[PDB]
Amino acid sequence: NGTGGAFEGGLFSPYLTTRLPGWAGVRQNVMGSTVDGRPVLPANSSTMTYATVGNSSLDSTAAAAA
Amino acid sequence: MTFEVDPMDEPTLLYLLFEVFDVVRVHQPHRGVIEAVYLRTPFSAGN
Numbered sequence: 001n002g003t004g005g006a007f008e009g010g011l012f013s014p015y016l017t018t019r020l021p022g023w024a025g026v027r028q029n030v031m032g033s034t035v036d037g038r039p040v041l042p043a044n045s046s047t048m049t050y051a052t053v054g055n056s057s058l059d060s061t062a063a064a065a066a
Numbered sequence: 067m068t069f070e071v072d073p074m075d076e077p078t079l080l081y082l083l084f085e086v087f088d089v090v091r092v093h094q095p096h097r098g099v100i101e102a103v104y105l106r107t108p109f110s111a112g113n
Contacts, residue, residue: 009073020079 035059084109 003010020026025046035042038059043050069080086108093101104112 003013028047029045032043033041086106088106091103
């Protein structure tokens with residue numbers, strides 16, 4: 001579109017320096033789900049509501065509480 | 067390097083490898099002190 005329209009491919013501008021770094025959050029709008037051992041959707045995305053830090057709440061610990 | 071890749075609607079990623087040498091020298095001179103020095107010749111990682 002802006003980089004495309006009728007021109008060189010959408011990756012014409014850069015030099016692709018961003019060797020995909022090793023860490024989570026290199027996926028812009030993935031509805032990254034599935035906290036480990038928890039089907040509950042953890043992240044609405046990696047690009048929102050992450051200023052506030054981890055829920056840090058109770059996931060499945062029940063035997064210890066009893 | 068500039069690659070020309072036919073389009074895909076799903077955002078793949080290129081996976082390039084620079085073949086190098088990844089030797090290792092394992093030295094143990096006492097009753098167990100395993101000392102090793104690493105050396106990757108072209109793409110060295112050493113301060």
